[PDB]
RNA sequence: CUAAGAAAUUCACGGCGGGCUUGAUGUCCGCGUCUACCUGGUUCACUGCCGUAUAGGCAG
């Protein structure tokens, strides 16, 4: 996003990822009436942000500086392959640091 | 039909003054190297044999 992605990201991250349901399959799993149970007519005008908080745009696109390539199919024409940069895999391999290069158990 | 396809790093400059590395020392002691072979393979142009053109007396 922009340079304003430090606070709202940590605010949005914790509620969806990290729930604590492991113990029971029967007890306190059939609950649906433990809400606040308020009225629906009182908050009509200024609660306009329930639906637009998630829905970003789609439109699958590439760019003219985006590294596109042709790959020959067996006995046939081509598929145009547009590779992307793996952020998560480079981040996982950036745990080349603490366990291997100059973490504590390695330098010991 | 290629992580495709593109690209000017550049200008200038004082490294420098001085200096005690010393002193001493047991390398010794022993020893069986042997047998055989063809350089009879192409391993520098050493003063006294009348003329490239197809031509002329080599008791080397």
From Swiss-Prot:
Name its GO BP terms in alphabetical order.
Answer: defense response to virus
> Knockout consequence?
Mutants lose phage DMS3 infection-dependent inhibition of biofilm formation while there is normal biofilm formation in the absence of phage infection. Decreased production of crRNA in the presence or absence of phage. Disruption of the entire Y.pestis-subtype CRISPR region disrupts crRNA production but does not alter phage resistance (possibly OLNs PA14_33350 to PA14_33310, and the flanking CRISPR loci), indicating this CRISPR is not involved in phage resistance.
**Which keywords belong to this entry?**
Antiviral defense
Q: Superkingdom, according to UniProt?
A: Bacteria
Stated role: CRISPR (clustered regularly interspaced short palindromic repeat) is an adaptive immune system that provides protection against mobile genetic elements (viruses, transposable elements and conjugative plasmids). CRISPR clusters contain sequences complementary to antecedent mobile elements and target invading nucleic acids. CRISPR clusters are transcribed and processed into CRISPR RNA (crRNA). Cas3 and Cascade participate in CRISPR interference, the third stage of CRISPR immunity (Potential). Involved in crRNA production or stability.
How is the subunit organization of this protein annotated in UniProt? Interacts directly with Csy2; part of the Csy ribonucleoprotein complex with a probable stoichiometry of Csy1(1),Csy2(1),Csy3(6),Cas6/Csy4(1)-crRNA(1). A Csy3(6),Cas6/Csy4(1)-crRNA(1) subcomplex is also formed.
Any further remark recorded for this protein: In this bacteria, Y.pestis-subtype CRISPRs do not confer resistance to phage DMS3 or MP22, but instead are required for DMS3 infection-dependent inhibition of biofilm formation and possibly motility.
Family assignment from sequence similarity: Belongs to the CRISPR-associated Csy1 family.
Q: What is this protein called?
A: CRISPR-associated protein Csy1
Species of origin reads Pseudomonas aeruginosa (strain UCBPP-PA14)
Q: What is the lineage of its organism?
A: Bacteria, Pseudomonadati, Pseudomonadota, Gammaproteobacteria, Pseudomonadales
Gene transcribed to yield this protein: csy1
- Which part of the complete protein is shown? 110 to 217 of 434
């Amino acid at each position: 996003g922009n340079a304003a992605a430090l606070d709202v990201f940590k605010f949005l991250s914790l509620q969806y990822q990290g729930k604590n349901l492991l113990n029971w399959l029967t007890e306190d799993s059939a609950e649906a009436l433990q809400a606040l149970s308020d009225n629906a007519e009182q908050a009509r005008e200024w609660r306009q942000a329930f639906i637009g908080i998630t829905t970003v745009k789609g439109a699958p696109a590439s760019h003219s500086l985006a590294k596109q390539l042709y790959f020959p199919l067996p006995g046939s024409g081509y598929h145009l392959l547009a590779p992307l940069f793996p952020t998560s895999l480079v981040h996982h391999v950036h745990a080349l640091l603490r366990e291997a290069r100059f973490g504590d158990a390695a330098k010991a």
